[PDB]
Design a binder for this molecule. Structure first.
Ligand SMILES: CCCCCCCCCCCCCCCCCC(=O)OC[C@H](COP(=O)([O-])OCC(O)COP(=O)([O-])OC[C@@H](COC(=O)CCCCCCCCCCCCCCCCC)OC(=O)CCCCCCCCCCCCCCCCC)OC(=O)CCCCCCCCCCCCCCCCC
Ligand SMILES: CCCCCCCC/C=C\CCCCCCCC(=O)O[C@H](COC(=O)CCCCCCC/C=C/CCCCCCCC)COP(=O)(O)OCCN
Ligand SMILES: CCCCCCCCCCCC(=O)SCCNC(=O)CCNC(=O)[C@H](O)C(C)(C)COP(=O)(O)O
Lengths: 67, 178, 110, 88, 80, 459, 124, 98, 128
């Protein structure tokens, strides 16, 4: 592959480098989409985070402010 | 680096040096080309607005104020050409530079390769050996009794003379020796 | 980190060699189209360095950040870690913007 | 490989190319031996701008002490050739 | 090998940011005598370039197409 | 051990009966053969020493020193013959005779069973060195240097002699075996304090101790190349060997007494390392580096632990080899350019690549790169000092930094940069100089391959 | 998080101390409490060489997961169920720790308020 | 401004001399007068070193105690030992939190 | 108009910011001419030997010889015992020694006192 200078013009390009660049960007994006589709919980979490305010006093074993 | 410096700089020389420094640092601040062109034209207009000042005292005061402004507003990280005294490849190829006299120390086996090059080298050495005394005589005659005021050297003036003190300027190693 | 850091330095060296040993980003113009493979390699490396999900940098940096957030730790250290992981994306943006986008700023002998 | 073996003709062509793109100098009347101050009628600031344009074109910087003495394109190309070791 | 420089008269500031810079200079009585030395940075194959988001989503089209066709194959492969 | 002593006394008439153009060859060959013979002394025991007779014995501490001396003699012979080419035959034979006498005195010194015979030989080593310095030195200060080399020594060693004879009037023997077996504690009295000082200060001035070191830069800079090699390689180690021998009778007075010498040694290693950073002469830098290393050895001997003694032995051998190599390296450039200024000749890596490789290896070994025996000795001494007191790691640590700096500084000043333009007589390196460097450097790494041979009797 | 703001800006006494917890008896508010049981024996955990920190109450699921990973070695995508069970056990343990924190918080609040109210009643 | 005639003339003379010197640096076509299988790499660089290393470890290093020490293999409930043949019981009847 | 720059020892004053170079006198011009004449004479003297075809060796520089001699051998002849010299010598050559002696003696006294009471945790301390 012989590529010569241009002097104020866009350089010459061979089809192989565009093909490889586009292919690699494409497989990166495909991998990201496929992994997100199959392992979404790795980003959004898996188990629900509980809110302690909705826990009953009886469950926590606290006397009704009398004893 | 090639020219002999003078005893001092004149007012116009300092003005031009400040102009060049200001333009370069403004380009460092204005990365993109159109913005740089706009602000460089503005700087040129600001610069030649006081171009016709006949009072030298006010001229020097303006120069001093301009230099103070430059020092305040300079770029801490200006663009440097890669081979300039501050560039990232300034003295990169100095280790590859070898002086020519080293070729005298080569083994005759090493000199057996490249016979024509060493024949040409012998021709050059003969030329220098023949020209040395004429160079010394010319330097003696041209120079004043007190001594030489500047570092400038005279050229050859006679029929077959060479410029005095030429050997180490002509036989520079190279810019990209290897 | 080894993978994408080595690759980022390699792409930087490729750019330096192409532009006659020039290293200042202020004299690098539009290399997105002029240098396709280098462009995609640097983009992938930058996205991995910033911890884009499911890339190589994610599987360690994300876990590190969420382990720092959920530990009994110094508060100033946590805040500085967060500010640093923001500045990481900042300087990756700086590199991409100044080196690959825009119009050429290198000498005319391409 | 690396950059081609730059020659004197290329240096002259590029210097003239930069010069005809200066809006203040007309292309037709410009010649290789034209003095910047006498024939084209430029002052010192224009010479400084020309030197910076040359530096940008060839990718290296000329010190001011040397830059002041260059007054016609032939001197510019001679300085460039001497700096970069160009003999052909 | 053996190519000459392009004709110098094709470099114009027409349709470039240099045009707007020149217009703004004319509004102040100044002029820009170096635009034709920069016109080559906008004239040819450097005329247009992508944005930051456009650069990040370089190979998104082909990757999304592959992901969609793979998922479609997976959905009607469990029908065995 | 007459099987090593007699061949040197035979080296004498062989030199004086040789043809005018064969002295160097014969001397070098037979010195190398004597070194090979002396290699047999390394087979040492684990409990006692090799007691050859009533007069001579070999310990695990003295055998590596003997091997180092016998190995150094051919190196000095090789180094000297370049600058003595124009000398007449008789004066060349006299120079070789001085070197042979010095080696004989050192060999007999390192194996004497009695302390008084050790004193006599350790003082007889003065005469050939002084003659060499004051006769075959190059500049005019050499005479002054000789005086500084002489009286500085004698002022320290004359009291020791007195102490020595006094001891023999009290215990009845100066034999090192009887002295070791019949050892008695020293009380805390003024008489015992001054006995301690008399026994110690001679060896202190020989190392030399900081503040008593002013003779060393003069003597090592003004001497010829062989004189410098023997001064830095072996003659400094006499003080350490003598101190390690004599400390067996000074307990327990040593703990109280050592403090000023320990502080002097530590602050002086710091000061001499700092001095090496601003030195315009190349030989003076190497001299002050020697002072720093010997200060470390002084600390090691003074704290008096087994690990410290192993470190002292290893460091002494390593420093001898390294300093001899560095002095030879400097002398090559000096012979080229006839000046000792360090910034005069620059960028020598461009002109002499293999010589630059030798410079790099010598500078690497000077800064104690692992796993060289330099680093082994230094680390053992540092560990012993840390056990002595945890704060010492400060001062030692600082030394480990400064040393490296000046070492690399030397290299960067001589080999890198751009060559001096007007120096146009840098001839290519000879086979003799390269062989000298290789014969200096290879035994160091070979010793690293088997370190127990230079770790002393405490191993 | 809000607890940090409530403690640093909020009254210190009301908020629980992470280093000193619990400060009330385990059976204070409860009439009776079951003792939490452990499935994996000490010998099994020692043989599995789990870790000094992984030997919690969820160690049995971890042992199952490690065995499943070792058995299905080339298929490193086969141990999804066991991983999920171990994660679920860890989640339950963390939820129980949150329960304990909230218990200490509201016990401290109720106790201090009740003591202050009783003091106010007895002070009049 | 500019060169003086003396500087100009000296520049031309030195420049012509320098071009001549640089021209003389070329090499004529004969200047370097020199005076007078497929998978072999995997054998001399992999197989021989591994032979030497394996022999040295098997017959010299192992011949001394505690030279090559391996941590014990992991043992799980339900496993069978090769040497003794003993089996390990199951694990205490999981509560089955399905 | 703009914030000012103050020079220091390790960050000196630029030439363009120097007020001495903006208020010049014919005496200053004569001095500059003399300096240039001296420099040019020295440069010619050097270049005459540098380009000599018959010169083999090094060109001896009297300035370098003077520098080395002044930095090495001219110091003691020009030394006078003054209050400043005596104070600086005493401080820099005495203070560190006693400082380190006090530090090390205190450390070792503490360690010995701790050892005497039998509470130092010297278990496994085999090598010393
Ligand atoms: C680790 C590698 C293992 C290799 C196994 C085999 C190695 C055999 C080596 C034999 C001894 C080395 C030669 C020393 C004298 C110089 C000879 C010479 O003139 O060369 C010109 C010759 C011809 O080239 P030329 O074209 O003329 O070039 C001349 C120009 O000037 C251009 O010259 P240059 O630029 O090429 O300069 C020479 C080059 C190299 O030259 C040297 O610097 C040699 C000296 C090395 C450093 C010395 C200071 C440190 C002391 C350490 C002591 C270790 C002793 C071990 C036993 C050695 C017994 C001999 O300089 C360097 O590259 C920098 C060296 C940095 C060394 C850093 C090493 C740190 C320690 C490494 C680990 C050692 C222990 C391993 C086990 C650890 C636990 C698992 O080039 C060579 O022959 C190659 C040089 C040798 C490089 C080997 C470096 C590693 C080996 C160290 C010593 C041998 C150890 C063997 C056991 C394994 C270790
Ligand atoms: C270049 C520097 C070298 C100079 C250093 C030289 C100084 C060496 C240290 C002084 C050595 C003098 C001691 C001589 C040998 C003593 C042996 C001995 O044990 O004798 C003692 C006696 O000790 C003495 O008599 C010593 C007195 C000192 C006299 C000479 C003074 C020399 C200078 C002293 C101060 C110097 C301090 C060291 C030098 C510091 C560095 C400048 C016991 O004798 P008895 O009388 O039987 O006692 C028991 C019954 N009553
Ligand atoms: C980017 C941050 C730094 C930039 C800030 C810089 C600020 C400085 C801007 C203001 C500078 C001035 O105007 S300072 C104005 C100085 N005034 C004079 O010099 C009057 C006398 N004029 C002459 O001598 C000649 O005409 C001469 C002009 C030399 C041309 O010479 P030629 O015609 O023969 O080439």
């Amino acid at each position: 592959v012989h590529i010569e200078p241009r002097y104020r013009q866009f350089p010459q390009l061979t089809r192989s480098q565009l093909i490889q660049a586009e292919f690699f960007s494409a497989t990166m994006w495909f991998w990201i989409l496929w992994r997100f589709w199959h392992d979404s919980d790795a980003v959004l979490g898996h188990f629900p985070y509980p809110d302690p305010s909705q826990w009953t006093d009886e469950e926590l074993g606290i006397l009704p402010d009398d004893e | 680096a090639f020219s002999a410096p003078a005893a001092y700089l004149t007012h116009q020389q300092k003005v031009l040096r400040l102009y060049k420094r200001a333009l370069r640092h403004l380009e460092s601040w204005c990365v993109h080309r159109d913005k740089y062109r706009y602000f460089a034209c503005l700087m040129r207009a600001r610069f030649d607005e006081h171009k016709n000042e006949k009072d030298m005292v006010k001229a020097t005061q303006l120069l001093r104020q301009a230099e103070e402004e430059f020092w305040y507003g300079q770029h801490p990280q200006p663009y440097i050409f890669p081979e300039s005294p501050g560039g990232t490849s300034y003295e990169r190829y100095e280790c590859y530079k070898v002086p020519e006299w080293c070729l005298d120390d080569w083994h005759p086996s090493e000199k057996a390769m490249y016979p024509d090059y060493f024949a040409k080298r012998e021709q050059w050495k003969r030329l220098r050996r023949e020209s040395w005394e004429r160079e010394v005589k010319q330097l003696q005659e041209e120079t004043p009794p007190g001594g030489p005021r500047t570092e400038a050297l005279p050229p050859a003036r006679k029929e077959g003379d060479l410029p005095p003190l030429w050997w180490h300027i002509v036989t520079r190693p190279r810019e990209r020796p290897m | 980190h080894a993978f994408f850091k080595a690759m980022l330095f390699m792409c930087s060296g490729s750019i330096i060699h192409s532009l006659n040993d020039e290293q200042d980003i202020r004299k690098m113009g539009g290399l997105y189209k002029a240098m396709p493979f280098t462009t995609t390699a640097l983009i992938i490396g930058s996205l991995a360095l910033t911890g884009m999900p499911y890339l190589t940098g994610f599987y360690s940096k994300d876990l590190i950040i969420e382990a720092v957030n959920m530990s009994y730790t110094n508060a100033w250290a946590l805040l500085m870690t967060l500010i640093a992981t923001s500045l990481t994306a900042a300087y990756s943006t700086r590199i991409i913007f100044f080196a690959f986008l825009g119009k050429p700023r290198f000498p005319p002998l391409v | 490989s690396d950059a081609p073996p730059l020659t004197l003709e290329a240096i002259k062509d590029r210097v003239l190319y930069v010069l005809k793109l200066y809006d203040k100098i007309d292309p037709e009347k410009l010649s290789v031996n034209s003095h910047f101050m006498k024939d084209l009628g430029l002052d010192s600031l224009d010479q400084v701008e020309i030197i910076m344009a040359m530096e940008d074109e060839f990718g290296f910087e000329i010190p001011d002490i040397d830059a002041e003495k260059l007054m016609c394109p032939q001197e510019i190309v001679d300085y460039i050739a001497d700096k970069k070791d160009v003999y052909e | 090998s053996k190519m000459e420089l392009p004709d110098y008269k094709q470099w114009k500031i027409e349709g470039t940011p240099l045009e707007t810079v020149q217009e703004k200079l004319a509004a102040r009585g100044l002029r820009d005598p170096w635009g034709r030395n920069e016109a080559w940075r906008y004239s040819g194959g450097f005329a247009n370039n992508v944005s930051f988001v456009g650069a990040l989503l370089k190979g998104f089209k082909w990757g999304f197409a592959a992901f969609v066709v793979a998922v479609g194959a997976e959905y009607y492969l469990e029908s065995q | 051990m007459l099987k090593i002593i007699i061949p040197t006394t035979m080296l004498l008439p062989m030199t004086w009966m040789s043809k005018h153009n064969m002295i160097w060859i014969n001397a070098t060959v037979h010195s190398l053969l004597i070194s090979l013979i002396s290699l047999s002394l390394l087979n040492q025991l684990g409990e006692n020493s090799l007691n050859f007779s009533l007069t001579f014995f070999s310990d695990s501490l003295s055998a590596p020193l003997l091997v180092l001396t016998t190995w150094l003699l051919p190196l000095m012979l090789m180094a000297s013959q370049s600058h003595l080419s124009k000398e007449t035959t008789t004066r060349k034979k006299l120079y070789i005779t001085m070197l042979i006498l010095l080696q004989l005195f050192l060999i007999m010194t390192f194996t004497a069973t009695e302390l008084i015979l050790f004193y006599i030989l350790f003082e007889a080593t003065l005469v050939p060195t002084l003659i060499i310095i004051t006769r075959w030195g190059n500049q005019t200060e050499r005479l002054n240097a000789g005086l500084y080399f002489l009286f500085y020594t004698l002022a320290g060693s004359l009291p020791l002699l007195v102490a020595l004879v006094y001891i023999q009037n009290t215990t009845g023997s100066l034999n090192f075996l009887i002295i070791h077996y019949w050892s008695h504690p020293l009380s805390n009295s003024w008489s015992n304090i001054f006995m301690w000082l008399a026994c110690i200060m001679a060896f202190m001035v020989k190392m030399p101790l900081y503040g008593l070191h002013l003779w060393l830069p003069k003597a090592h800079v003004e001497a010829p190349i062989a004189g410098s090699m023997v001064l830095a390689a072996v003659l400094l180690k006499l003080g350490g060997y003598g101190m390690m021998r004599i400390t067996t009778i000074l307990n327990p007075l040593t703990n109280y007494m050592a403090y000023p010498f320990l502080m002097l040694s530590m602050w002086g290693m710091i000061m001499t390392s700092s001095i090496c950073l601003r030195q315009t002469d190349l030989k003076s830098l190497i001299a002050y580096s020697s002072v720093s290393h010997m200060a470390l050895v002084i600390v090691a001997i003074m704290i008096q632990t087994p690990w410290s003694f192993m470190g002292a032995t290893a460091l002494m051998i390593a420093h001898g080899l390294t300093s001899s190599m560095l002095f030879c390296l400097a002398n090559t450039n000096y012979e080229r350019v006839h000046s000792r200024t360090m910034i005069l000749a620059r960028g020598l890596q461009t002109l002499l690549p293999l010589m630059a490789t030798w410079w790099l290896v010598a500078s690497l070994t000077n800064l104690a790169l692992p796993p060289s025996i330099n680093l082994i000795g230094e680390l053992f001494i540092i560990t012993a000092s840390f056990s002595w007191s945890n704060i010492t790691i400060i001062l030692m640590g600082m030394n480990m930094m400064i040393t490296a700096l000046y070492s690399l500084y030397m290299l960067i000043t001589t080999q890198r940069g751009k060559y001096t333009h007007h120096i146009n007589n840098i001839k290519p390196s000879f086979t003799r100089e390269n062989a000298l460097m290789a014969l200096h450097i290879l035994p160091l790494l070979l010793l690293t391959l088997n370190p127990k041979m230079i770790l002393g009797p405490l191993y | 998080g809000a607890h940090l703001a409530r403690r640093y800006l909020g009254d210190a006494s009301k908020e629980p101390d992470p280093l000193r917890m619990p400060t009330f008896p385990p059976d204070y508010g409860f009439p009776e409490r079951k003792e939490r049981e452990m499935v994996a024996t000490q010998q099994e955990m020692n043989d599995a060489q789990l870790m000094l920190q992984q030997r919690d109450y969820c160690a049995h699921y971890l042992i199952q997961l490690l065995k499943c990973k070792r058995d299905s070695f080339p298929n490193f995508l086969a141990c999804k169920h066991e991983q999920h069970d171990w994660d679920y056990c860890e989640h339950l343990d963390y939820v129980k720790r949150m329960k304990e924190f909230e218990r200490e918080r509201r016990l401290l609040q109720r106790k201090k308020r009740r003591e202050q109210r009783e003091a106010e009643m007895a002070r009049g | 401004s500019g060169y003086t005639p003396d500087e100009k003339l000296r520049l031309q003379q030195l420049r012509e001399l320098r071009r001549r010197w640089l021209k003389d640096q070329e090499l004529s076509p004969r200047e370097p007068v020199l005076p007078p299988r497929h998978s072999i790499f995997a054998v001399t660089h992999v197989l021989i070193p591994v032979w030497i290393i394996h022999y040295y470890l098997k017959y010299h290093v192992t011949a001394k105690p505690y030279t090559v020490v391996e941590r014990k293999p992991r043992i799980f409930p339900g496993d069978t030992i090769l040497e003794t043949g003993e089996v390990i019981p199951l694990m205490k009847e999981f509560p089955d939190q399905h | 108009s703009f914030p000012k720059y103050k020079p220091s020892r390790l960050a000196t004053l630029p030439a363009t910011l120097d007020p001495a170079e903006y208020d010049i006198s014919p005496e200053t011009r004569k001095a500059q001419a003399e300096r240039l004449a001296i420099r040019s004479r020295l440069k010619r003297e050097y270049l005459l030997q540098y380009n000599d075809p018959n010169r083999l060796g090094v060109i001896e520089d009297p300035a370098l010889i003077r520098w080395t001699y002044a930095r090495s051998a001219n110091i003691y002849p020009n030394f006078r015992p003054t209050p400043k010299t005596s104070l600086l010598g005493a401080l820099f050559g005495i203070g560190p020694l006693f400082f380190w002696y006090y530090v090390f003696k205190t450390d070792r006294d503490k360690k010995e006192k701790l050892i005497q009471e039998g509470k130092l945790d010297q278990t496994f301390n085999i090598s010393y």
